[PDB]
C-alpha cells in the first residue's frame, strides 16, 4: 500500500524508492495497493512464462498425446511461439477456465488487497469457505508447506528476492517475445527462439 511500507527497495537503485517519473506521488495510496498486487502478479506470471519459454526453445516436451491424435512434439514443432496457437482449443479453454476460477476466488476473499489487505498475498486456499462448493483442500501456494521452516526475517528476504527475480523475469520474457517479433533486437537469442 503506502509506497513506503512496501519492501521492494533494493541495492540496484540505491536504498530508496525507485519512482523516477513520480507515478506514486500522483496516486491516493489506494492505487499503490493495486500496483503491488499487479507487480507481483506480473513478475510471477513472467517467471513462469520465462522458464516455460526456455523449456520450449530447448525442445523438451512431454512424452506425447496432448490430445487424442496430436502429439506434444508435433504441437510444439515450430518452436514455443507458435506452440500456443498449435495447442488444442479445448485444452486451451480448460486452462483459461481454471485460471478464471483461481483469479475469481482470489478476488472474492473478504479483506481483498485494495480494501485493507496485503497486496501480493494470494489466499493459500482459494476454493474453501464457498457454500455449495467442494475442493480437496490443496492450498494453492506452497502446497507442501516449504515455508514453515522459514522465520519472519528469512521470508522477508525471500520476498525481496521474489520481487527482484519477478522484475528480471518480466524483462526476460518481453525480451524473448520482442526478439522473436523483431530479429536481432535481442542479440543473445539463437535460431531456436
Amino acid at each position: 500500500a503506502f509506497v513506503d511500507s512496501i519492501e521492494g527497495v533494493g541495492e540496484e537503485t540505491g536504498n530508496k524508492i525507485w519512482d523516477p517519473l513520480g507515478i506514486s506521488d500522483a496516486v491516493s495510496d489506494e492505487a499503490v495497493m493495486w500496483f503491488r498486487h499487479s507487480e507481483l502478479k506480473h513478475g510471477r506470471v513472467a517467471m513462469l512464462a520465462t522458464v516455460g519459454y526456455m523449456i520450449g526453445a530447448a525442445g523438451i516436451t512431454f512424452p506425447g498425446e496432448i490430445a487424442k491424435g496430436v502429439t506434444f512434439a508435433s504441437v510444439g514443432a515450430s518452436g514455443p511461439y507458435a506452440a500456443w496457437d498449435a495447442t488444442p482449443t479445448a485444452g486451451k479453454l480448460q486452462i483459461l477456465t481454471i485460471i478464471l476460477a483461481l483469479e475469481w476466488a482470489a478476488e472474492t476473499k473478504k479483506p481483498h488487497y485494495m480494501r485493507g489487505g496485503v497486496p501480493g498475498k494470494i489466499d493459500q486456499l482459494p476454493f474453501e469457505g464457498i457454500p455449495g462448493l467442494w475442493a480437496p483442500k490443496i492450498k494453492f501456494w506452497d502446497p507442501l508447506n516449504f515455508m514453515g521452516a522459514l522465520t519472519e526475517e528469512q521470508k522477508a528476504r525471500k520476498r525481496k528476492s521474489e520481487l527482484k527475480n519477478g522484475r528480471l523475469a518480466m524483462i526476460g520474457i518481453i525480451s524473448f517475445l520482442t526478439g522473436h517479433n523483431i530479429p536481432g533486437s535481442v542479440p543473445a537469442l539463437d535460431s531456436h527462439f
Binding site: 483442500k137 507442501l144 508447506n145 516449504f146 515455508m147 521452516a149
Partner: protein
C-alpha cells in the same frame, strides 16, 4: 527430522541428507516426504517381486485374461514391458481406475490427514483386515517399520535397476 524413522546404523546412524532437502522442510513437508517414501517403497517392492516372479519361471495364472480376445496369461509374454503392453487397454484402464479410487479413498477417508496431523503412509482401510499382525508390541512394530523402509529403498534400487536393464541392458551387472 531425527524424530522420524528410517535412520539406521548403515549411514552413520544419522540423517542421510547430502543435498540438505530436510533443512527446508516444515513438519508437514517432512510428513509429505515420508508418505511419498513409504508409497514409493511399497510400490517398488510389489513391482520388483512381480517382475522377478514372472521372469524367473514359477507358477502363473491358470486361465484366460479375456475370453472375447482370447489372450492367455501364458501368451502374454512372461516379460515385463511387453506383457504389460499385451494386456488389453481396458484391463489397464480398470487397474488404474481401481488404484485411483483406492488413492482417492486413502486421501478423503482417513480423517487425520498425514499432511494435516496424521500418521504418514497408513491405510486403516486396507492393512490386514482380519488382524494377521495386530497384537504385537510397539517396539517390534517400530523396528519392523524400520525394516520396511530399509528393504523398500533397496527395492526402489532393484526396480529401477530392472527398468534400466530393460532400456539400457549394458548398464547393470547380470540380467
Amino acid at each position: 527430522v531425527a524424530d522420524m524413522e528410517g535412520v539406521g546404523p548403515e549411514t552413520g546412524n544419522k540423517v542421510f541428507d547430502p543435498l540438505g532437502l530436510a533443512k527446508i522442510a516444515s513438519p508437514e513437508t517432512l510428513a509429505w516426504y515420508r508418505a511419498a517414501e513409504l508409497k514409493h517403497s511399497r510400490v517398488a517392492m510389489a513391482a520388483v517381486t512381480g517382475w522377478a516372479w514372472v521372469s524367473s519361471g514359477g507358477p502363473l495364472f491358470p486361465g484366460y485374461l479375456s475370453i472375447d480376445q482370447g489372450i492367455t496369461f501364458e501368451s502374454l509374454g512372461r516379460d515385463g514391458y511387453a506383457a504389460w503392453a499385451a494386456v488389453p487397454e481396458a484391463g489397464k484402464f480398470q487397474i488404474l481406475g481401481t488404484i485411483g479410487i483406492l488413492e482417492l479413498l486413502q486421501e478423503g477417508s482417513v480423517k487425520p490427514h498425514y499432511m494435516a496431523g496424521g500418521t504418514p503412509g497408513k491405510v486403516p482401510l486396507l492393512w490386514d483386515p482380519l488382524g494377521f499382525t495386530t497384537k504385537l508390541s510397539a517396539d517390534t512394530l517400530a523396528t519392523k517399520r524400520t525394516s520396511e523402509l530399509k528393504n523398500g529403498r533397496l527395492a526402489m534400487i532393484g526396480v529401477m535397476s530392472l527398468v534400466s536393464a530393460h532400456f539400457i541392458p549394458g548398464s547393470v551387472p547380470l540380467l
